[PDB]
Design a protein around this ligand. Sequence first.
Ligand SMILES: Cc1cc(N2CC[C@@](C#N)(C3CC3)C2=O)cc(NC(=O)Cc2ccccc2)n1
Ligand SMILES: Cc1cc(N2CC[C@@](C#N)(C3CC3)C2=O)cc(NC(=O)Cc2ccccc2)n1
Ligand SMILES: O=C(C[C@H]1NCCC[C@@H]1O)Cn1cnc2cc(Br)c(Cl)cc2c1=O
Ligand SMILES: O=C(C[C@H]1NCCC[C@@H]1O)Cn1cnc2cc(Br)c(Cl)cc2c1=O
Ligand SMILES: [Br-]
Ligand SMILES: [Br-]
Ligand SMILES: [Ca+2]
Ligand SMILES: [Ca+2]
Ligand SMILES: [Ca+2]
Ligand SMILES: [Cl-]
Ligand SMILES: [Cl-]
Ligand SMILES: [Zn+2]
Ligand SMILES: [Zn+2]
Ligand SMILES: [Zn+2]
Ligand SMILES: [Zn+2]
Lengths: 487, 468
Amino acid sequence: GLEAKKEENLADWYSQVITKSEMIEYHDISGCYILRPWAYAIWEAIKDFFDAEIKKLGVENCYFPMFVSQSALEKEKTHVADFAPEVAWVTRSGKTELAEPIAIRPTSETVMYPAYAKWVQSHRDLPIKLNQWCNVVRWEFKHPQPFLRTREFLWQEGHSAFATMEEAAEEVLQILDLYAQVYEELLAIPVVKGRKTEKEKFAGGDYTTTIEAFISASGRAIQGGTSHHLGQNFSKMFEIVFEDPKIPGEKQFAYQNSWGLTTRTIGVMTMVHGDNMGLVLPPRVACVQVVIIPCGISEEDKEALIAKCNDYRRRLLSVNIRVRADLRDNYSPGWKFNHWELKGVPIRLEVGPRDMKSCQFVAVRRDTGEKLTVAENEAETKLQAILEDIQVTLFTRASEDLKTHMVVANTMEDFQKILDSGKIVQIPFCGEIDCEDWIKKTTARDQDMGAKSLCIPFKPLCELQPGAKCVCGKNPAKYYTLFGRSY
Amino acid sequence: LEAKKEENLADWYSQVITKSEMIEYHDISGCYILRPWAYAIWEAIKDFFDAEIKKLGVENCYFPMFVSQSALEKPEVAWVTRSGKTELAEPIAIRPTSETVMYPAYAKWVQSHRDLPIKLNQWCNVVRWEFKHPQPFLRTREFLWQEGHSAFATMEEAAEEVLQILDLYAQVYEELLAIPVVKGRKTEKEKFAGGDYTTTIEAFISASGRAIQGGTSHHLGQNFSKMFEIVFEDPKIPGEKQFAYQNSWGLTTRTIGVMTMVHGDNMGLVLPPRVACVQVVIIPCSEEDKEALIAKCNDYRRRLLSVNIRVRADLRDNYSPGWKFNHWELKGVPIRLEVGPRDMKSCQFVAVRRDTGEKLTVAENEAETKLQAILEDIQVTLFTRASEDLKTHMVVANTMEDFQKILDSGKIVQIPFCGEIDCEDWIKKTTASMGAKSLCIPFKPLCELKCVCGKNPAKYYTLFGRSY
Ligand SMILES: Cc1cc(N2CC[C@@](C#N)(C3CC3)C2=O)cc(NC(=O)Cc2ccccc2)n1
Ligand SMILES: Cc1cc(N2CC[C@@](C#N)(C3CC3)C2=O)cc(NC(=O)Cc2ccccc2)n1
Ligand SMILES: O=C(C[C@H]1NCCC[C@@H]1O)Cn1cnc2cc(Br)c(Cl)cc2c1=O
Ligand SMILES: O=C(C[C@H]1NCCC[C@@H]1O)Cn1cnc2cc(Br)c(Cl)cc2c1=O
Ligand SMILES: [Br-]
Ligand SMILES: [Br-]
Ligand SMILES: [Ca+2]
Ligand SMILES: [Ca+2]
Ligand SMILES: [Ca+2]
Ligand SMILES: [Cl-]
Ligand SMILES: [Cl-]
Ligand SMILES: [Zn+2]
Ligand SMILES: [Zn+2]
Ligand SMILES: [Zn+2]
Ligand SMILES: [Zn+2]
């Protein structure tokens, strides 16, 4: 069984859960982890959804090189200098030094935007809407954590270029809403949509929109996905331009966006829904939604029981429920109950001889442990209903927790008190970078780490009163901003 | 398209892959951008192969790209040596293939025979930093592939899988890409040194008279399980351990390059309907009649989508119809569906098939039926022509002189062969301006069976050729 308790040592519980659910295997290189099928399948579910949705918006998939030349990486002001010591450099092939070192992509702006500049020769060439599913590398020496913060990770990065600001601004919010759908509708995780402050936005962009999630077990928030409006900053840098004949003597620089989402998704799912029995899969992304286990197991009664289990399997498959029949003779029914509970399968379907003879079975929900006796004839109906109820239940519980842990404060003193209780706080804020630094410094100083901004919510809990001051007291508030201790 | 396939193939190829918007060049050599038109073909291959291996019980995963020095050493490898300006404690290698990352995990996952089989696949990128001359799709420094790695308790289930995977690869080439291939096994010289035997599919590119390996499926036997200690308890004998039997298999975007080299023509790319992102492109050729024509095009679009035909209506105002004809011809779209006002008012349309250029006039009410028929015929036609080509260019020669002569005509040859490494080296140096290498020992040779070296008897008919 799982013996680590989530409320006692969270980091050990997390390591136990991700390994005993067979999601993660550790590699011999720090910050690099093997995604076993149980975790990879969740990424595949997210991919299926998001891929279909961006195709509806006109985005097409592609694959750009993993390697960036020294010249291309350092040619334009695409990234702040603090990232320099975290680029992984290939310097030799076999035993002999390369003429010029080449970098592993940490993101693909510097490989994609020179090609965009080649491809945009007139108005007709826009828009360009490309996505790629790929791995990136950011070689930090801070402590890594499986799924949440790693050196190599899988993601998707979309990059779009448009003739007008309005088309681009529309896409930014559409993509952000798809990310919120990934978290809320697939993973049953509530998120807060907002704009990053000036300090936390992508430096080279116009503005950054974000979704923020809350991990109550650690009292910390974490960014779930991001959608940037780059404006014309990168088009001016890379000369992504066209000319209108109706406007002679003027360049038209493309308006650009970029957006990304990673396997961090899975880690947040694990941290939010996981419990002291192990992983808990939302039915929308569970590789296996129902596991059928023969229990209470004569020598032809046994064959009848096995055939009944396969009857349920085929009926469920027939109604698009993802189902596995664990018919292993080697393992005890208790062993199987435990194995699939650790893996978070939403429903265990128990079939024993007595129930078979009485044309019934037992369904056990993973989230609550509730057991239900179901008539055989209702199998497809009831189980679908139960799966839907599990999904809602998970979201509802997580939403309640966010509601208790995200609150309004209008003074530094109240903010400090609430923050130190392990919650995130919406405060009136002047938006200035220096003030944000001061908030981090003084909440660190006065705690009894510093708070960072998470986002400026699009829909704050309260509306800023006229003349309301920032918590710094010195400048008027520009907006309610969500702050907390962060991942 | 200006360049001609029959004169300057390399230039023809560069023009076709760029004007079809499949490839863009990168500022590092041997690395190429896969634009959507190319990537879509890879996605179609992936959809097929992924479904098929799932039916065999293979599960997808993702192992790390980085290999430690020690694990790798238990070679044109790209080495990471620093992060920023900070030298790493130890250099780490980019995977050229994932045996050395996967099999330590395999050895930890296998304790009893109940832990077998293990059947894992990953769709990923690998890196082989050679300085030989690269070619888009066909031979590149970084490439997308799938690598499957399986572990079993017995030799027999492993052997079964090797052959099933090779047949899936032959399905990818022959059924999806309309490319005939020759199944066989590699000679001692050419087989994977880390395995017991290597099965392969070989394809032929007549424009260069050269063969190319399309995919590969190895039986590794107990080589790697002895090296990495992938062991399980003997079910009958107390205390005794057995080593697992293993396979690995792989397939890359080389597929798309072979498809381009085989079916492409002097008008550009030619897509087999089974992998074409767009199978039919609808092109329009009084304000009321303008609106009605657009609506008719949209009718065809919706009807073809309703019958699961992949269709785009190019209703764009900012491009001439002739520009569209040429654009979608360069891209190899199998069928151009032309609707003009007169066609609309005659309840008919024109379908132009890309492979032959034939223009068919089709009654409107038959749109869904006939177009499906035409798509099927295009697929078959492509395959049939390619097979004709292969049969024309693969012949038996039972003596060296004829073999050399056959080879210099730009063909590949099945010869009686002894199998010895020394002899294969001698055939290479003799036939040299490259000398011929062995391609495979065909499962089904042209003729039933001494070597063409004389000094030895022939162990098998072997297919030899100048190879990519
Ligand atoms: C797994 C994962 C995810 C993400 N990030 C980033 C923001 C983002 C969001 N939202 C991306 C835009 C989509 C995200 O998920 C970032 C990372 N590694 C790193 O920072 C490097 C690293 C390595 C070791 C320790 C600490 C840090 N690792
Ligand atoms: C695109 C592609 C494909 C393949 N290979 C290999 C055999 C195989 C088959 N069949 C794999 C098992 C699946 C295949 O496709 C190999 C490659 N690059 C290389 O050798 C490196 C290289 C780079 C520049 C010049 C010369 C050589 N590049
Ligand atoms: O990667 C980004 C901005 C956006 N790029 C497209 C995908 C979504 C993503 O939010 C910001 N970023 C983040 N981390 C980086 C690390 C390094 Br090292 C470098 Cl060089 C550059 C960067 C860098 O540019
Ligand atoms: O990669 C292979 C053997 C098989 N691995 C699984 C996928 C299918 C493939 O045929 C052979 N191979 C090929 N090229 C290599 C290049 C280098 Br560099 C290294 Cl270290 C190792 C290798 C190496 O092992
Ligand atoms: Br980022
Ligand atoms: Br290989
Ligand atoms: Ca001006
Ligand atoms: Ca709390
Ligand atoms: Ca012994
Ligand atoms: Cl679902
Ligand atoms: Cl029934
Ligand atoms: Zn799975
Ligand atoms: Zn302030
Ligand atoms: Zn496409
Ligand atoms: Zn010989």
